[PDB]
Design a protein around this ligand. Structure first.
Ligand SMILES: C[C@]12CCC(=O)C[C@H]1CC[C@@H]1[C@@H]2CC[C@]2(C)[C@@H](O)CC[C@@H]12
Length: 246
């Protein structure tokens, strides 16, 4: 039942709306990634809200959790698309925004792109299952909270704990075995922790970009600028931190 829902609520394809006839320029490429961010967020909000047990969380916590976790959530799914599609050779941000080494450079994001490409690579190196992925992605929504807890921190802990048990559940079967089960869970929880440093590098990047957006001609859509100037700082100043397994 858990998996039927995750499989059922999983978002479809989201295009960034990039003009691929115009030259790659920092401004263009980043305005596109931002718009894509605005579009994908609309879908993350719907998905999250349709997550089993999600409604147990307090209304403000529901929103807060989405607002702190979107970067890692989008980065993780983006790595999956790059994987199932381009076998991790390039970053499949959208069907109309697939970065090559040249785009990775002309974006002043080469490094972060290397790390995300590296993540996508892990889905391969580890042979991640579509279902392990659905579960791992679900748990990333419950992977970053304020240091002083949320309004109803007891519902989040319940919720989060349950998602950890489903992850172990979907490996403890044919998706693990012999001496795998223990090793399999150590590597998946290790792969999950890996998305966090990558998310933080992008948080600082996007934040700096937003402060000087008017000068590099890159513009951030409504929700992006608001969430980047209201929520992301709380993360960057240490008020909200990721939950690490290791
Ligand atoms: C979440 C997004 C948008 C959705 C996606 O597939 C990947 C991804 C990772 C890079 C983010 C991007 C949104 C726009 C950001 C935050 C830029 O300002 C700098 C890094 C970009």
């Amino acid at each position: 039942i858990f998996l039927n829902v995750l499989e059922a609520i999983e978002p479809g394809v989201v295009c960034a709306g990039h003009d691929n006839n115009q030259p790659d320029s920092f401004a263009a490429l980043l305005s596109s990634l931002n718009e894509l961010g605005e579009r994908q967020l609309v879908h993350v909000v719907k998905w999250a809200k349709a997550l089993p047990g999600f409604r147990n969380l307090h209304v403000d916590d529901q929103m807060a959790v989405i607002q702190y976790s979107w970067m890692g959530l989008m980065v993780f799914a983006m790595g999956w698309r790059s994987f199932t599609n381009v076998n991790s050779r390039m970053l499949y941000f959208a069907p109309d925004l697939v970065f090559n080494e040249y785009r990775m450079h002309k974006s002043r994001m080469y490094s972060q792109c290397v790390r995300m490409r590296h993540l996508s690579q892990e889905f391969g190196w580890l042979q991640i299952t579509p279902q392990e992925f659905l579960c791992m992605k679900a748990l990333l929504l419950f992977s970053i909270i304020p240091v002083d807890g949320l309004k109803n921190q007891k519902f989040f802990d319940e919720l989060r704990m349950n998602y950890i048990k489903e992850l172990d559940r979907i490996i403890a079967c044919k998706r693990k075995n012999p001496t795998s089960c223990s090793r399999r869970f150590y590597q998946l929880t290790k792969l999950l922790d890996s998305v966090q440093p990558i998310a933080r590098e992008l948080h600082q990047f996007t934040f700096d970009l937003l402060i000087k957006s008017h000068m590099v001609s890159v513009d951030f859509p409504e929700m992006m600028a608001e969430i980047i100037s209201v929520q992301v700082p709380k993360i960057l100043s240490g008020k909200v931190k990721p939950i690490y397994f290791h």
